[PDB]
Amino acid sequence: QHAPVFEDSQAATVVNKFQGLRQGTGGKTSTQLPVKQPFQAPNPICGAFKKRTIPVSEFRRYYDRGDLPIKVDHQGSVNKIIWVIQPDQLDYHHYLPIFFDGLREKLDPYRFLAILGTYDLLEKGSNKILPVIPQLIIPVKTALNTRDNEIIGIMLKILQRLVVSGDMIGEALVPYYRQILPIFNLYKNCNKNVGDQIDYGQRKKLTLGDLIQETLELFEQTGGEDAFINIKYMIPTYESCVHN
Amino acid sequence: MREVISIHVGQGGIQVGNACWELFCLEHGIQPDGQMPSDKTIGGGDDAFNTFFSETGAGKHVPRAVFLDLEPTVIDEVRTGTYRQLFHPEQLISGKEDAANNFARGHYTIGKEIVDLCLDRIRKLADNCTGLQGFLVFNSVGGGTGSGLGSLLLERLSVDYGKKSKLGFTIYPSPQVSTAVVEPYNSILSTHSLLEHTDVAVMLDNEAIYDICRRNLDIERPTYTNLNRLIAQVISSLTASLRFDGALNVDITEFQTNLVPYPRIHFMLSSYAPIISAEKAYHEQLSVAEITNSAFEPANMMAKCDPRHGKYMACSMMYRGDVVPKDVNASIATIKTKRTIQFVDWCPTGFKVGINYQPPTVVPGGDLAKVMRAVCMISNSTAIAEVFSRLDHKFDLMYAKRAFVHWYVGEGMEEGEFSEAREDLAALEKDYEEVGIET
Amino acid sequence: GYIPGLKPNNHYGASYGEIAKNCLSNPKVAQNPFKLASTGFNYQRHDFRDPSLTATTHKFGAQTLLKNHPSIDQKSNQWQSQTHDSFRNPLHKPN
Amino acid sequence: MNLDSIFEWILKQPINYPGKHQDSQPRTNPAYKPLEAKAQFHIIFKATGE
Amino acid sequence: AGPIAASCYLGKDVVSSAHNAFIQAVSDLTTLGHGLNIDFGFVKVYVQDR
Amino acid sequence: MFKNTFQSGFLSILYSIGSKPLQIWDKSIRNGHIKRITDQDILSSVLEIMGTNVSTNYITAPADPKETLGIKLPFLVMIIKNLKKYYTFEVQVLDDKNVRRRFRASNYQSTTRVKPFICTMPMRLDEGWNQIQFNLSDFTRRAYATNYIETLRVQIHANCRIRRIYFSDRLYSEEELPPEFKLFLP
Amino acid sequence: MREIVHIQGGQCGNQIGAKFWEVISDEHGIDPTGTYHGDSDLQLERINVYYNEATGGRYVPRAILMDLEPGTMDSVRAGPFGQLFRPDNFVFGQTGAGNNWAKGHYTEGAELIDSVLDVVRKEAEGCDCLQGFQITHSLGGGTGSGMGTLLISKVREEYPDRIMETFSVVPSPKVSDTVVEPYNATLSVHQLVENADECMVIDNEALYDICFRTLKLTTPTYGDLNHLVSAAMSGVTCCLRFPGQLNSDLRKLAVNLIPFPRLHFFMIGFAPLTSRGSQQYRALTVPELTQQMFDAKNMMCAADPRHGRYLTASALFRGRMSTKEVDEQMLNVQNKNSSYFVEWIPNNIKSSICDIPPKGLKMAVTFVGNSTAIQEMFKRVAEQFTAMFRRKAFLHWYTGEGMDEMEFTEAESNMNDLVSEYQQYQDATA
Ligand SMILES: Nc1nc2c(ncn2[C@@H]2O[C@H](COP(=O)(O)OP(=O)(O)OP(=O)(O)O)[C@@H](O)[C@H]2O)c(=O)[nH]1
Ligand SMILES: Nc1nc2c(ncn2[C@@H]2O[C@H](COP(=O)(O)OP(=O)(O)O)[C@@H](O)[C@H]2O)c(=O)[nH]1
Ligand SMILES: [Mg+2]
C-alpha cells in the first residue's frame, strides 16, 4: 500500500499571518458577528439496499462428500451434465429442495451444477412436482433475500420455468404469494431511464424491471381468480393483465 | 316572490350554516324562536324575508334551509342548541355512520341511503316556492362525506331540475396548512364531479382568511367562528340585492351572464372590505375610493392566490351603503389607470357594479364594527391556475406509489376514476393557459 | 408591555382590545388573601401548605393534579360563541 | 473504515460538521508552511496518539 | 489541547474544534454496519455493527 | 415545420428505425422510462414508453411551445402494440373559424361528451399489434359541425410500444401501402 | 350511537381494564354503585357508547373478562369500581396455560372459547349500531397471547366490516420477566398482523423511564403504569363521546394513519406530564404541549423516533383552543424537522380538537405516530428468538401439543419479511 508523506502536504494561497493571543470578542458585539452552525445528525438511510451476507449453502456440503448423482461432461463446448441415474427414478422430494438451495452458491462448479440441475429436473418432471411445493418456499425466499442482482435474476428465471413447467401448479402456489412477493416491491421500478439511445441488454436479461414485470404477468396468467387480488394486496402499484 | 334554497352538507357546511343563519335572523329582526316580536319592530317593508323564509300563516317563520350529515354529533348539537324551535324538526337529516374522510364511502356506500330522503325534502321545499331563483350549497371540499354527498346531490339535481341555478361555496385546502392527509384525493375527485355540474363556484381557503383576521382585525388566536362570520357577511352582501332596494340591482341570474366567459371557467375568488375593529374603525374616512383600493390590493384576497401573477377576465362587485354612481365611476377609472393591474386583451370593459342601500348589519359579540360603506368583490382571473397546479402536484406525489388507493377501491370505486379526474384537471389548466394568451 | 391575562390561559378568538379589557376588568390580579407583605418581613406569618396521603404499600401513588383546572364549566364552543342578543349592547354608551 | 474513510466522511460534508478544521490554517511558526486540511488533522491525530 | 497545539505548531482553538469534530463518530456508528478500526498508535479499537 | 412543404400521399412524423427517431419530439418523464428494444412479436426494434401515472409521462410532437406544427393532412394513423394497460393520446386541430380545439382519446374512459375545447372519446383495443386510423374529419364535422383546416399537435402518453406514426390521407389497404409503411406479419 | 364493546383477557389485560374502567367512570361521573351523580349535562348524552342501562336506573360496562385461571377475576372483584361488571360475562378456565402459547391457543382455548364467543355475539347483537371492538392484552404471557389472537381471528371472520383495536404490551429485552417471551411474542405477532386493524404497542421499560425521569416520583408501580395507559386509551376515543371542532372517530384515524394494509403498528404518547412540585410553574400552552409531545423521551415505547423517519403523525387535543395555534405549531414542527419526515407524502400530520378536557386539566394532548422506528423492536425480538431456537431449547413443551417447528419457521420468516418490507418505505425517494 501507499500514502503521501503527510507532514509535507501543504496549502500555499492561505497567508502565514497568525493572530496570536490578541483577539477578543468582548466589547465588539456587532449584530453581524458569526455564530456556530451546530452539528446536525445526517439523514438516516438504513440498509434496505445493502448486501445480505449470503448464508451457507447445502449444495456444497452434499456435493463435497458426494451423494448426489450428477456427472460433469466436457464433450460439449459448454459443460452439459449427464445423469448417473435417471431423473424420473430420482426422488424429487429429497433432492429438488437441495438443488433449489444450491442457487445461492457462486463458486464453481457448485453454482453451475445447481442451476443447470434445477433446469433439467423441472423440465423432466411431469406431475411429481406438484406435492413438493410447500417445502420449496424456504430456498426461494432465502435466495431472494440476497439482494444480489445476478442471483435475483437467476431465481426469477427459475420461477418462470417452474410455473410454465406443469399445469395445476399456479393455483396451488396462490397461498404462498405472501412471503415470496414482497421482495418484488423493492425492485419493481428499478429500470434504467436510458432515454433515446439503443439498449443492448435484450441479449442478457439483466433488466430486472422487465424480468419482474414478465414474471408477475406470468403468475397472474397461470394462477387463477384470486391471483389478482393477492397481487394487488401484496404490491400496490400492480395493474391487471387478464382484466381488459 | 323570489326564493332560493340553501343546502348545507358536511361539518364545515353545518358550522357555516349556523353562523350565516344567525346573521340573516338578526338582519330581519326575527327572534331565535322564529317569532317576529309584536313590539319593537326594526325592519320596514314586507316579503323581504320571503327570499329565505316562508310564513307559517300565523306568527313564526321557517327557514328555507336543509342540513345534511352522516355523523349525528353536529346535528344533535344544533337540535339541542338555542335555535331548536327555528328549523323544522324533520329537515335536519342525520345518518349513523360517517364517511371517515373517504369520498368513495360517501359517494357509493352510505350516502345513497340518505340521498333519496334528501331529494324528497328538496321536492317538498321547492313545491312551496313560486319564483325559485336557485340553490346555494355549502360543503368543505377536503372532507369525505361533504364532498361525496355534494357531488351526488349536484348530479341528481342537474337532471331533476335542468336549468336552475346552483352556487357552490367551496373551502379548498390551503397550500401548506391542512388538517388531514388524504384530502387532495377527494378534493380532486369532487372538483372533477362539480366542474360539469355547478354553475358558479367560490374559492374560500382557510389560510387567507386567517391572515386577514391577523392583519386587519388584530386577532392573534382566531378560530372557526370568526371565519364563519366573515363568510356569512360575504353571503349577505352578495344576496342583499334580492331583498333590499338598490340603485342598480343585481340578480343571481345576473352572474351566469356576466362572469363566466366560457362554460368551463366558473371558479371565482372573493374579497371584502372594510374589515376593521371598532377600536380604530372610526378614526378614518372610510371613503369609497380607499375602500375599493382595499378591495383590490393582493393582500386582502380571500383565497391564497396572487392576482399579480395573471390577467383578469371579469370583476363583479357590489357596494352597500351610501355610495354614489359618480364616486363608483371615479374609483373605477382610477383602478383602470393603475398599471399593476392588467386585464385580458379581449375584454375592454370588465367591471360589473352593484349598488345597494342597506348597510351591513353587525352581530353582537362579533368582531366587525358598524360602518356605512362596504364592498364585496368577486373576480374571475387567470391567476387561479396555480392552486390547481399545487393540488395536482400534491396528488401525483402520493399517487405515484398508489398510496391510500385501497381505502377507496375497497368500497365500490374502480381503479380508473382517479386518472379521469387527473386528465380533466390537466385539461382545465390547458384551458386556462389557452384563454390567457393574447390574440 | 405585558397585559397580564393573555399568556397563561390562552384566550380564544376575540379582539385584542376586547381580551385586554376583559382580563384587566376581571377580578384577582391584586388583593392579598394570604396578606403577605412584599418586603419579606412577614414571611413566617403564613406557613407554606399545599392542600392526599400518598401510600406505596400496595398500589398507585400518582396523586391527582393541583386545583388550577376547570370543572362544571365544561361547555360547548358553539354554545359559548353562538348566543343571540342577550349580551351587552355593542354600541350603547348612554349620553 | 480504516480511520481514513472517516477523514473523507467528515470532510465531504462541511454543512453537517462546520468548523475550523474544514479549511487550512496558518501555523504559529513562520518557518512552517500552512498545511492542507486533510493532512493537518492526520498530524493532530498522530500527536494526540503519541 | 495546548501541548498538542504546541507540538503541531498550530492553534489551540483549531485543534480543539478538530477534536470536537472527530468525536462525532457516534453519528457514523449509529448507522448500521460501518465497522471502525481506529489505531492512532498503541491501542487498536475495533467496533462491529454494534 | 412541415408547412410550405409538399405533402401528397403520406407523412411520417415518428419512425422508430433511425439514429434518433425523435428529432422534433420533446420528452418529459417523471417516473417512467423510454427505450427502443427489438420486439418478440415483430422482429424489429420498437421505441417504447412505460411508467406510472400515465398523465405525467408523455412526449410532445413539437420540441417547444409557441410554434405551429400544423399538418396539411386529414387522416392520422398509428401502429400500436396492445399492452393491456392504460393509454391515452390527444390531437389539437384548427377548424374553419380561428379556433384551436382538442380531441382526447382514452383507453380507460367509458363516457363521451362534447365541450367547446375538449372532446374525450374511449377506445377498445384488440390483442397484440394493431393499426389504428383516426379519421378526424367526421369527428370535427359531427361534434362541431365545422370543417378542419390544420392539425396542430399530436401527443402520446405512457404504456405503449410505438412503431410508426404517420398520415395516410385516405383509406388505403395493404396493397396500396408501401412496403416500409405496411406492417409485416410475424 | 356507534358503540364499541370491550374485551380483556390475561392478567395484564385485566389489570389494564380494571383501571381503564375506573378512569372512564370518573370521567363520566358514575359512582361504583352505578348511580349517576355528575354535574354536567354532556356527561350523559353519549354515555351509551360504553354503558348499558338496566332497570333501576343503573349503568353497566359492556366489557367481557376472559382468562384461563380464576384468580384474576377473583382478585379484580375486590378492587374499587369492580362491582360494575356483570357476573355473567366473566369466563374462566380451571387449569391455566402456564405461559404456554400452544396450550393457550390449541388444547384449552379451543375448548373454552365457545362460551366467550357466544357472550361476545350476544353483546354485539344487543347494541343498536356497532363501530368495532377494542382489546387490551400482553404479548409476554401464553394465555393472553393465544386466547387474544384466536379471538381476533374468530371475531374478524364474523365481522369483516368492523374495526379492531389491540393495545399490545410488547416484551423488551432489558426488563425481562419471562424466559419464554420471544417464542410466544413472535407466534402472536404472526397472527396479529393479518387480522388486527390497529395495534398500539406499549413498553414497560419505557413506562419506567418516563415515570422516573419525567414525573420525578420516587416509587412508581403497576397502578401508576395502568393509570398512564388508561389516560392514553381514553384520549384516543374521547372525541367520539364528546363534541368538537373537528370530530375524528376511529375509522377516520384508521383511514388517515395507515398508508398500506400491513403497516398498522403504532407508538403513542400523552401530554402534559409534570412532577407534583413543578406543576405550579409550567405555563400550559400549545408550544409547550407540542414540544413535549414530539420529544423522543415522551414516547410510550423504547423505540427511538429520531433513528427513523415518520410515515404519519396524529395529534388529538382536548380542551378549548384556537385552531390557528394548532395548525401553525404543526407546520412549524414539520418545517423544523424536515429530515425526519418522509418526503413523498406532503403535510403528513393530522390534527383533531375536542372541547371537553380531561378532569383535572385545562388542556391535554394524545399523540399517535406511525413511524419507521418500530423495526428495531422486531430486530431484537427476532434475534433473541433465533438465538434460542437455534438450539431447540424450551421446545418440547410446545411440541407436546401437536404443534411442530414448521410453524415456528414460518412465523420467523413472515416476521423478518414484515421487517424488510417495513424498512423498504424508509429509503424510498421520489
Ligand atoms: N372554513 C372552515 N372549514 C372547516 C371548518 N371545519 C372543518 N373545515 C374543513 O373541513 C375539512 C374536513 O371536513 P370536515 O368539515 O371537518 O368534516 P366533513 O366535511 O363532514 O367530512 P368528514 O370528516 O368525513 O365527516 C377540513 O380540511 C377543514 O379545512 C370550519 O369550521 N370552517
Ligand atoms: N401494565 C401492567 N403490566 C403488567 C401487570 N402485571 C404484569 N404485567 C406485564 O405482563 C407480563 C406478563 O404477562 P402475563 O401475566 O403472563 O399475561 P397472561 O399470561 O395473559 O396472564 C409481564 O412482563 C409484565 O411486565 C400490570 O399490573 N400492569
Ligand atoms: Mg366531518
Side-chain angles (χ1 to χ4, degrees), chain A:
Chain A
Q1 62 91 30
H2 272 227
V5 55
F6 274 27
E7 51 275 20
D8 189 359
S9 292
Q10 48 182 352
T13 59
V14 65
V15 75
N16 288 36
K17 187 269 183 182
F18 182 76
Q19 293 82 17
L21 190 156
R22 303 316 169 234
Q23 278 294 104
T25 184
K28 295 137 81 161
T29 63
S30 180
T31 189
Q32 60 86 31
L33 294 174
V35 302
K36 305 78 168 175
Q37 311 330 308
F39 298 103
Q40 295 298 109
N43 43 207
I45 62 170
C46 293
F49 302 88
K50 194 202 271 273
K51 303 321 150 293
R52 185 66 165 80
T53 67
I54 300 98
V56 176
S57 173
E58 194 49 15
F59 199 44
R60 195 144 78 190
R61 185 177 65 246
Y62 285 137
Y63 181 75
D64 66 343
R65 53 194 274 285
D67 53 88
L68 272 68
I70 61 171
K71 181 69 176 177
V72 288
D73 182 75
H74 312 73
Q75 307 291 64
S77 67
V78 63
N79 318 88
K80 185 212 81 83
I81 62 170
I82 62 170
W83 286 112
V84 176
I85 197 56
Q86 295 302 319
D88 62 358
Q89 293 83 18
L90 293 174
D91 165 33
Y92 288 11
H93 203 317
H94 171 284
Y95 288 63
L96 189 60
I98 304 306
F99 274 101
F100 273 100
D101 210 0
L103 271 73
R104 304 211 286 292
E105 182 65 26
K106 316 293 280 312
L107 279 182
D108 291 331
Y110 284 109
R111 179 254 306 291
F112 181 76
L113 268 294
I115 296 89
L116 173 66
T118 61
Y119 291 165
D120 304 75
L121 274 296
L122 294 190
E123 190 276 331
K124 212 63 52 183
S126 68
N127 56 2
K128 194 213 178 288
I129 297 169
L130 192 150
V132 306
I133 300 299
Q135 68 273 18
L136 296 175
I137 303 309
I138 298 95
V140 293
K141 75 212 192 283
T142 300
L144 288 176
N145 282 120
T146 193
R147 277 172 194 92
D148 186 74
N149 304 7
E150 161 178 320
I151 297 169
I152 283 175
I154 297 300
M155 182 45 107
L156 276 296
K157 292 182 184 292
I158 301 299
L159 294 174
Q160 294 185 343
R161 177 52 62 60
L162 183 63
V163 160
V164 71
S165 64
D167 57 336
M168 185 64 72
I169 298 170
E171 62 272 19
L173 202 173
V174 168
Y176 313 81
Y177 283 51
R178 304 204 39 235
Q179 53 274 70
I180 61 170
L181 272 293
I183 289 306
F184 303 170
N185 190 359
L186 277 296
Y187 278 24
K188 171 141 200 293
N189 282 319
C190 286
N191 189 24
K192 53 180 56 47
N193 196 57
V194 65
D196 184 13
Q197 52 153 320
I198 297 294
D199 193 68
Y200 288 73
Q202 75 275 15
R203 299 176 27 62
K204 276 77 70 177
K205 283 133 171 183
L206 294 174
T207 75
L208 69 84
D210 189 358
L211 281 293
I212 191 167
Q213 176 59 237
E214 182 65 26
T215 44
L216 262 182
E217 62 86 20
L218 201 43
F219 292 168
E220 195 154 277
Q221 263 287 355
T222 305
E225 69 275 16
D226 291 331
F228 179 75
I229 193 64
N230 286 116
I231 294 311
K232 175 54 74 208
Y233 172 75
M234 202 55 267
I235 56 170
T237 187
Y238 186 70
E239 209 167 309
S240 164
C241 70
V242 64
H243 186 273
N244 293 315

Side-chain angles (χ1 to χ4, degrees), chain B residues 11 15 71-74 76-77 80 95-98 100-102 105 176-183 207 210 214 220-224 394 397-398 401-404 406-407, chain G residues 1-2 45-46 129 242-249 251-252 254-256 258-261 312 321-325 327 331 344-352 428-430:
Chain B
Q11 188 182 7
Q15 265 161 275
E71 193 174 350
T73 304
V74 293
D76 291 331
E77 184 65 28
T80 181
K96 291 183 179 180
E97 69 275 16
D98 193 307
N101 273 37
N102 185 287
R105 280 199 80 199
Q176 75 278 20
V177 165
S178 44
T179 305
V181 73
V182 65
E183 63 271 42
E207 191 57 1
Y210 281 145
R214 194 192 70 73
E220 61 285 350
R221 274 77 177 270
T223 186
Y224 278 146
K394 267 163 198 278
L397 281 173
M398 299 186 237
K401 313 303 191 63
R402 327 302 306 279
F404 304 94
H406 67 292
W407 284 119
Chain G
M1 272 205 88
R2 324 151 291 151
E45 293 179 353
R46 322 319 280 280
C129 171
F242 289 106
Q245 310 272 16
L246 293 99
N247 50 4
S248 64
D249 67 39
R251 211 164 201 106
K252 185 178 285 187
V255 167
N256 297 359
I258 295 89
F260 300 101
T312 45
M321 52 195 48
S322 88
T323 63
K324 193 214 161 53
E325 308 255 11
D327 63 358
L331 183 63
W344 50 268
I345 70 157
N347 189 358
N348 45 4
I349 308 92
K350 172 144 181 33
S351 58
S352 297
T429 61

Side-chain angles (χ1 to χ4, degrees), chain C:
Chain C
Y2 194 59
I3 297 90
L6 280 72
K7 274 312 211 73
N9 58 5
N10 57 342
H11 276 126
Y12 316 109
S15 178
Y16 182 76
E18 182 65 26
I19 301 299
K21 184 202 51 203
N22 263 357
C23 65
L24 285 174
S25 296
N26 64 7
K28 300 289 94 175
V29 193
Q31 68 269 15
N32 264 17
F34 293 100
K35 295 213 261 153
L36 277 296
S38 48
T39 292
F41 297 157
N42 275 336
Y43 64 90
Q44 70 276 17
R45 153 174 265 184
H46 186 273
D47 70 325
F48 296 163
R49 297 284 75 78
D50 283 328
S52 306
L53 188 154
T54 69
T56 187
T57 304
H58 296 77
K59 300 294 187 291
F60 211 97
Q63 183 94 30
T64 77
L65 282 294
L66 190 48
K67 277 74 69 177
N68 54 359
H69 296 285
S71 49
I72 193 66
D73 302 336
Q74 288 155 42
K75 182 68 173 66
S76 165
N77 212 332
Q78 69 87 12
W79 278 104
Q80 294 180 357
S81 66
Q82 305 208 348
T83 316
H84 46 291
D85 63 358
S86 67
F87 283 165
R88 83 288 189 280
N89 215 26
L91 72 165
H92 181 70
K93 184 172 277 187
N95 292 136

Side-chain angles (χ1 to χ4, degrees), chain B residues 13-27:
Chain B
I14 302 290
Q15 265 161 275
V16 71
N18 296 115
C20 66
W21 280 114
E22 300 150 338
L23 188 153
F24 307 97
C25 277
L26 276 296
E27 181 146 290

Side-chain angles (χ1 to χ4, degrees), chain B residues 112-174:
Chain B
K112 64 155 160 84
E113 289 81 3
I114 297 307
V115 298
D116 46 341
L117 188 153
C118 177
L119 282 71
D120 186 74
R121 182 46 53 112
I122 322 298
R123 179 197 37 114
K124 298 270 301 304
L125 267 163
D127 175 40
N128 182 267
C129 307
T130 178
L132 188 153
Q133 284 285 341
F135 305 89
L136 313 180
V137 61
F138 308 80
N139 53 322
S140 79
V141 69
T145 183
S147 63
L149 272 299
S151 63
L152 196 52
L153 271 193
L154 294 174
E155 191 145 290
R156 306 292 285 101
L157 292 175
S158 192
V159 304
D160 291 331
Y161 292 76
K163 303 322 289 163
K164 301 311 148 282
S165 56
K166 290 169 291 323
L167 283 72
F169 294 61
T170 61
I171 308 184
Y172 269 49
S174 296

Side-chain angles (χ1 to χ4, degrees), chain G residues 80-240:
Chain G
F81 281 120
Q83 295 310 327
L84 279 75
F85 286 121
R86 291 288 299 274
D88 208 336
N89 295 116
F90 292 164
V91 298
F92 64 110
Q94 298 95 292
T95 74
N99 299 338
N100 189 359
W101 192 92
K103 292 181 181 179
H105 195 281
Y106 276 18
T107 187
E108 292 211 282
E111 288 76 356
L112 182 142
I113 191 166
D114 63 358
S115 68
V116 76
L117 183 63
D118 213 8
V119 174
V120 175
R121 188 173 294 111
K122 256 43 191 183
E123 291 280 41
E125 52 76 21
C127 61
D128 74 347
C129 171
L130 211 53
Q131 183 64 290
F133 309 78
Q134 57 170 70
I135 299 170
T136 62
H137 59 86
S138 179
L139 265 59
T143 185
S145 298
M147 271 305 198
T149 192
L150 195 152
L151 189 148
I152 300 299
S153 182
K154 285 292 201 43
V155 166
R156 193 49 170 210
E157 61 86 20
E158 188 53 285
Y159 304 83
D161 63 358
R162 283 296 80 80
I163 61 172
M164 321 275 298
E165 267 197 75
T166 61
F167 285 71
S168 309
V169 176
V170 176
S172 62
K174 278 73 68 178
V175 288
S176 64
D177 275 292
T178 302
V179 299
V180 185
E181 277 158 33
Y183 284 78
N184 61 11
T186 300
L187 286 165
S188 61
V189 175
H190 186 273
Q191 198 84 28
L192 186 66
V193 62
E194 211 56 10
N195 298 299
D197 314 321
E198 301 167 11
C199 188
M200 282 195 37
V201 294
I202 298 296
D203 303 357
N204 310 130
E205 190 276 331
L207 295 184
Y208 288 122
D209 192 302
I210 62 170
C211 65
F212 184 22
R213 183 179 63 83
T214 60
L215 270 297
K216 299 289 94 175
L217 59 92
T218 81
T219 179
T221 184
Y222 289 104
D224 296 332
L225 276 70
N226 289 275
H227 176 300
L228 277 296
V229 167
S230 296
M233 294 182 286
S234 67
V236 186
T237 189
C238 66
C239 67
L240 187 138

